[PDB]
Enzyme design. Structure first.
Site, short mmCIF file in Angstrom:
data_model
loop_
_atom_site.label_atom_id
_atom_site.label_comp_id
_atom_site.label_asym_id
_atom_site.label_seq_id
_atom_site.Cartn_x
_atom_site.Cartn_y
_atom_site.Cartn_z
N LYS A 84 29.43 56.06 -7.89
CA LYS A 84 30.28 55.28 -7.00
C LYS A 84 31.68 55.26 -7.53
CE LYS A 84 28.34 53.86 -3.60
NZ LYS A 84 28.27 53.32 -2.20
N1 LIG Z 1 29.35 55.07 1.52
C1 LIG Z 1 28.12 55.92 1.54
C2 LIG Z 1 28.45 57.40 1.74
C3 LIG Z 1 28.71 57.80 3.16
C4 LIG Z 1 28.07 59.11 3.51
O1 LIG Z 1 27.89 59.98 2.61
O2 LIG Z 1 27.75 59.26 4.71
C5 LIG Z 1 27.40 55.83 0.23
O3 LIG Z 1 28.06 55.68 -0.81
O4 LIG Z 1 26.18 55.96 0.21
#
Ligand SMILES: N[C@@H](CCC(=O)O)C(=O)O
Ligand SMILES: N[C@@H](CCC(=O)O)C(=O)O
Ligand SMILES: N[C@@H](CCC(=O)O)C(=O)O
Ligand SMILES: N[C@@H](CCC(=O)O)C(=O)O
Ligand SMILES: N[C@@H](CCC(=O)O)C(=O)O
Ligand SMILES: N[C@@H](CCC(=O)O)C(=O)O
Ligand SMILES: N[C@@H](CCC(=O)O)C(=O)O
Ligand SMILES: N[C@@H](CCC(=O)O)C(=O)O
Ligand SMILES: [N+]
Ligand SMILES: [N+]
Lengths: 421, 421, 421, 421
Positions: free
Chosen positions: C111
């Site tokens: 992250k």
């Molecule tokens: N914010 C999502 C990622 C979005 C995506 O890959 O579609 C996550 O960290 O799992």
């Protein structure tokens, strides 16, 4: 378990590992690590295909061995010769580990060879061969990895091709990838005379330890090639006199003194030392019996033997050639109280200047003739001093001391770094 | 000039080299280029030092050979065996060049080995050996350069260790640096039955060329290991009857058919084929002469010889094992007109799926079991048909033709690429 | 020992840490390796200096965390929020490792965050913030190392900037360096409806396991944004009856069934569900207690609670939202016998289509919408099946079972690979 | 407005940051850039798993911080201590930016730490810990990037291991990847006495400016370890009078003076100073109040404190230790018109020799002891000269002037290079 890929007789390699054996008694706490000295880190056997002048392809056996790497990049020349064999190239790498640690270069030991008769090839063919070989061992090479050099049947010409070829492949000019390059290509001043001058430097360091004066001293020298005449000139420049020179044509003697510069003209002018008008001819065998302070064997191997060692009147024997005195002759010479400066450091002048060349190449900034000699003295006088101290402290001859020093330093490097992975 | 570093010994390497000689009259304008097959492109011999469990350091010999690199990265397994030798490793890498080119894989031929008895090392020591060997051959390795694989006394576990080691060295995860990995680490589905499935797929292609129906056909199988039992399962599953299996412990026979899934429960539990309730025992020498359509030697080498070839009543012999039939036995089978599907393409299922593993690894998108089986079928029928075609054009047998297909393709790659540098 | 750099309290991290503790009893022989899950592999904190529109420089805190990389490169979004903290980024990376392992994606978890309020920056300032961050974290990025995605307050626009900043800095087009890109830049089709479709795929698999027919079935859906209205379209298009939709306005209800496209047409006009001509209004509280087959929370977190969970009559809850249900609600729903397809796999369609984007990016070959949706069904049915099997095996609820499958896959990759260096 | 990941009290870092604030009023047109020094460019936190001798795995917090890197690559020790925290590593990296800049070394500031009690580990565990750490921070290391060194509880032994792990990981000989190595591996001569000599060189420059005579000047020295005894030796060799010495055993006063070589072999026999036959004992808080010209605090931090600064009647305090004066103690020493040469340049002898180590390592060419020393004087006289002139130009105490020179040089480098990306 000896190495399985050498078979029943291990040849030159066995001779190398026997010498490691003999050095083991003097290693102290480092002794168990000595085993690592009896196997090369890395052996690389490559095919080297070459389009011949007729347009047909010939295939050659090329080799590059990294015997040991604990102290730095592999370093060691490359030999073209029809009698090149895995075994020999491994043994020779083993000797470079020893030599480089004994003279205190920051290098490990390496060697290479191509099994080919270069007199059977045109200059074009030799070029294509050097280039393919360079490409094939390219995965080994780098100024921080492995720095080839000249050896038997190679020189400046081949070294330019290695450089040029690694530099084109890799996309930049990297002068320090090999040494013994021409001056124009990032080569170094003072290479030609390095070895013969280093014989004098090491001979003179021994003389101070035994209170022998150099200015009075008399010198006899066998061989008048690059090393011999360079040694001659240095002795003559420091006040000593060269009273006899032997070479392949004949021998010349003059107790009053021979001029090395004068003699040299005659050497290229006619072919050899024979018939030099300012000296008398002398029979091959009597050369060895001359009353002298310094004797310099600077020619072939096996020249001071059991057969003539008793004749030697020299206070100091300084070894210009590799292995000029037999083990039997050593025992005799130790008996007669004569100081033998071993080839290991005595002839290390060339390898020291190629180290200098590697060094200048990093930031392409070249030294003067005089800084080269001064730094050449510092290196070899320090190597003589460390080898002398060990010879005294362990009561062994200088030759044994040199191999103890070498093994000790490699094995200390390895003990420190540790076993990883 | 034979390779000087082998010594007057050819051994396994000379056997490879003679097979190359035997293919030359079928090579046409590619023939002069066949010399290149008689020398590996490179040999790397490494020292693999290992801290044993008792605190001491042991030194093992490691090898990695790249025989030929022209159609692709070098590809081949790594063997841990106290009898591993330079010359063996070379020859096996030569056979890999040939196997990959005949099966049509985009690979060259590689091979590695450590001279070690793994029975004598604990799991920890085995791990440390594997890591250090993979670090030592680091300079060769990478998904686009050289991809090792399981071989004798290595499997999933060692492969996991090789992947993780190289990955940690290079600070990226690189699943495709080896194959035969566990699924959890980017392995491939379908690998276990691959070679066995592939024996059938090759026997079926052969069958279709002679109008031999698979449904209702009779099969006899020597060997009920991973190859043998999976080949039996394939045959059964396409509607053939397995009527006889010969084992370690004996032979069972039953014309109504033997259920291989039932037989397997027995070989796993009881210990071997002997005493299987739903078949009668048979004397070993009676196995070979049985009236059957397909005969599958999937056990040891030299099992079909002069001594038994004349009795064989099979229309198709499909080689699951390597070398199960002698050249004399070949000549007999030719005279009788029984088709021999050669080990080179017939047992290539496992090798074909390792390739699928590497393909899948490049983008970590993994195929289903059915997808693996279907693409496996494509590869192996393409391979059969290409060999069949050369067999018919030059009027030579399948075995010779497979070797002719391999050589022609390697030299063809090399002819187009050209000599450089 | 707890992580010193977080100090006493936690807080999002201690929460993740406790979930690891609760999963340990079900870990078997992998249990002693679970400690590795309670520490990030790697934490990078960067300063991100940005020239503001007014000519002054401002300094923002940037973060990228690799929680675990045992299964593949780090994967997880970058978030821009003034309440971004080190602790929170760490825990979210922890949840990514678990998520990717549970859905069976070949990725570790990562992250990132920047501590910034993006409402207070211009688009020009947000570009400069994105470009500098990607540069500062560049030592970490690469398709085989670390692949960021959109998250809170980021989207296609800044993924396009990350891809460009990395590409330009590195001298190559590397579309696969991030996912969530515009389709013009190597994005994947099928992204908008992925999560909603995934909620359906996974619900239907649960339905199969309890013999519940989808055609007959009534569906209540909370939320009508991208997740909610795609789930509704999917349910209706497989013959299900959507009877209730709750939005930020209020709730609409119709026993006969709501056409979700027609509803969607009505929402794009009026800005929400309400006064939708073809459904009666319902008070929010009646929504949760509706007798339905499927209940789908696809709005905010914590919508199913101790307050309303005891009122639920649905046979299947299928979590479209991130954590829509509290642990006290899970306990209640368990006693009541309602099946809860946990968010970790239920909402994973998005993250799976990102995986697909990355896969396609390796050779710039993009699949049709039809192919994306088929491949998406495959991933999520497999993921559900694996969670189901462990849930039955260990007699635990699906939510817990998803955490066990995840931790097992991670730990098994770690065990196979070994500890090195 | 502090960094979010340290909380309301940042302890050590807050102290560093507060010190940057107090320097801002002296920065001229670079004053706005000073905010950049209040952020670390890069903080890397790794997990370092080690296999313990007992077979279990232990997990340790490792840190490498790059505070600032505008002037050159990061430079700073790695510390093993159980009190190491993120906050502290950050502060120390900050002080390293100041120190490196103050002395004019071409380095940015860095620092590493492992949070571990090394007295709880065996030498094998300490190795495996060291090698894992150097692997985990691998992505940061390189002679042109980040060059670590010894600090609390680390030395030559750990450095050797770092050089080795890193060189093996990368397949190259890279001596200059850390400094403080053994000479056998590319360490520098003159490291033992460098700080000691520096304390003197720097004390002398202070004398040559306040009309103080070195010669017959009396010197009291706290601490007789590496730093203390080399300081005494150089004060002595320059005609000065070591009248007092205090280490852990007591204090030995002698009006007439103490010959340190004589004192040395006394401490190198009986364990400390306490029993010295050629001096009288007059400890302990008495020592500070001695009428002297030079007071050299070369033991622990916070020795000259707000509780015993009153007694001090010396003309020049020359700080050999790190932080041997509290800020309140500075005010009092300012009040009494006593010169304090600040530790930041006064003890910078070791760090300059580390710089020389790295220099020599680039071409593996090594300097004599005489050269190291002449070069060390050149560096430390220039540093003082620059610090002096700013203390005079801006009428500020020597400590504050050093910080100002440090802040100025860094910011000028930042301003010249400009902001990018
Ligand atoms: N914010 C999502 C990622 C979005 C995506 O890959 O579609 C996550 O960290 O799992
Ligand atoms: N870590 C090295 C030591 C240095 C060397 O032998 O070159 C090894 O285990 O081999
Ligand atoms: N042939 C010698 C000398 C090479 C050189 O001049 O450096 C060697 O291999 O070491
Ligand atoms: N031992 C076989 C195995 C092939 C494989 O499974 O990948 C080889 O080396 O070719
Ligand atoms: N340029 C290559 C082509 C053949 C090959 O790749 O093996 C060579 O002459 O070696
Ligand atoms: N060799 C790796 C395995 C686990 C991983 O890749 O995270 C380690 O020691 O940490
Ligand atoms: N321990 C000090 C000095 C290290 C050295 O001698 O270079 C530091 O981290 O800066
Ligand atoms: N271009 C650099 C200059 C300062 C440095 O190199 O640390 C920056 O924006 O941060
Ligand atoms: N030698
Ligand atoms: N295919």
């Amino acid at each position: 378990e000896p190495l399985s890929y050498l078979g029943k007789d291990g040849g030159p390699w066995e001779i190398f590992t026997e010498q490691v054996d003999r050095v083991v008694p003097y290693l102290g706490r480092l002794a168990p690590l000595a085993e690592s000295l009896k196997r090369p880190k890395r052996v690389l056997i490559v095919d080297v295909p070459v389009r011949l002048d007729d347009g047909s392809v010939a295939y050659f056996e090329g080799y590059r061995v990294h015997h040991n790497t604990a102290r730095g990049p592999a370093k060691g020349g490359v030999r073209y010769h029809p009698e090149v064999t895995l075994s020999e190239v491994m043994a020779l790498a083993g000797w470079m580990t020893i030599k480089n640690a004994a003279v205190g270069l920051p290098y490990g030991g390496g060697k290479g060879g191509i099994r080919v008769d270069p007199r059977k090839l045109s200059p074009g063919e030799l070029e294509r061969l050097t280039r393919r070989y360079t490409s094939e061992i390219g995965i080994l090479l780098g100024p921080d990895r492995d720095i080839p050099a000249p050896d038997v049947n190679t020189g400046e010409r081949e070294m330019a091709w290695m450089m040029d070829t690694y530099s084109m492949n890799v996309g930049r000019t990297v002068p320090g990838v090999v040494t013994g390059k021409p001056i124009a290509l990032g080569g170094s001043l003072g290479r030609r005379d390095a070895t013969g001058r280093g014989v004098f430097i090491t001979a003179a360091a021994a003389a101070e330890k035994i209170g022998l004066q150099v200015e009075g001293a008399r010198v006899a020298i066998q061989g008048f090639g690059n090393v011999g005449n360079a040694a001659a000139r240095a002795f003559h420049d420091h006040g000593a006199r060269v009273v006899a020179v032997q070479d392949h044509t004949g021998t010349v003697y003059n107790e009053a003194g021979i001029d090395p510069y004068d003699l040299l003209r005659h050497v290229q002018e006619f072919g050899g030392v024979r018939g030099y008008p300012k000296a008398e001819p002398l029979p091959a065998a009597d050369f060895w019996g001359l009353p002298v302070e310094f004797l310099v064997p600077a020619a072939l191997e096996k020249q001071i033997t059991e057969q003539n060692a008793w004749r030697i009147r020299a206070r100091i024997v300084a070894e210009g050639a590799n292995g000029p005195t037999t083990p039997a002759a050593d025992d005799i010479l130790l008996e007669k109280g004569v100081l033998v400066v071993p080839d290991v450091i005595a002839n290390a002048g060339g390898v020291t200047v190629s180290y200098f060349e590697w060094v200048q190449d990093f930031n392409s900034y070249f030294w003067t003739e005089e800084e080269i000699n001064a730094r050449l003295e510092r290196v070899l006088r320090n190597a003589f001093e460390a080898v002398w101290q060990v010879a005294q402290e362990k009561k062994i001859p200088l030759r044994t001391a040199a191999y103890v020093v070498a093994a000790t330093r490699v094995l200390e490097a390895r003990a420190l770094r540790g076993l990883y992975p």
